């Protein structure tokens, strides 16, 4: 089945431009056997936007634990 009806990623908006000052509480979605979908809310626009799992600010925020 080369269509893949179910099991869809929120693996889309891999934006490198991430503002750590405007970033609100990031939500790491618990999707098993997928990429780490880190949907981080933005405090500037009050809208949920995806962040790629390679940003330095997101890596520092994850490692600050």
């Amino acid at each position: 089945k080369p269509v893949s009806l179910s099991y869809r990623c929120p693996c889309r908006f891999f934006e490198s431009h991430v503002a750590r000052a405007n970033v609100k509480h990031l939500k790491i979605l618990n999707t098993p056997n997928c990429a780490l979908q880190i949907v981080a809310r933005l405090k500037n626009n009050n809208r949920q936007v995806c962040i790629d799992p390679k940003l330095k600010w997101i890596q520092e925020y994850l490692e600050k634990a």
Binding site: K1, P2, V3, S4, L5, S6, Y7, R8, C9, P10, C11, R12, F13, E15, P32, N33, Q37, V39, R47, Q48, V49, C50
Partner: protein, 281 residues
Amino acid sequence: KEPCFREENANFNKIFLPTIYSIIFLTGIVGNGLVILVMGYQKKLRSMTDKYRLHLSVADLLFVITLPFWAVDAVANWYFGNFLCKAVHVIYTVNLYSSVLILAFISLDRYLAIVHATNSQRPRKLLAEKVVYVGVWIPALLLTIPDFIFANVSEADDRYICDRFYPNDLWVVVFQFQHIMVGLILPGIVILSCYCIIISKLSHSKGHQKRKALKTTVILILAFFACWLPYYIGISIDSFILLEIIKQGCEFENTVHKWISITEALAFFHCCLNPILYAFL
């Protein structure tokens, strides 16, 4: 930059899908059983085309054996493990590629029969006896090696679903475009080329009675492509939804997924129309 808006619904889909699966499975297994018992076991074939239709009915019977597993996947949750999931996926992929390679071989055989009606009878028998296997089964089995590898069972919200899983979206885009390519473009171009040559060469004849073999053939091919056209259109729209071209559509992407499921259910009517054409003339 909103990731998904994951939303399930599928209230009508979860019951409409196994109904269509059940009627298609029932008439497909009945028609393919009668075709295999009459034209394959008793060797009652008279014309040349029926051997290709026997191969198509064999692949059809193989697919409709595993169609009730898709019905159980639709209405209920998958409980058959990973080996049966792999077997169902490889059977579906090999049937989907095999049937369109049968239709390509039938168009090539009709081109050899109509145009070269004098000197081409020995290559027709060789083509339909020995070259047919290495044309329609060997290239079909090499296109399901990633289906052999990447099909497994993952862990959703206690769902145990069966699907192909890829490391990244680029593999999904590449394999969707390859599926579109092999399933539609090149065999459709080949079928169009031989039918254009046949139609151009038929005008020199004085309205010959050879059109009776052509009529069922063009009816079968046109019905197959009419069944498979909106599914391929939806797959092309989803593949262009990927690579950020029409990325504004999120609920539009959900509608694309719903229509892909609906005309994927409706594209399985390509099975039963091969013995239905044998019931008629």
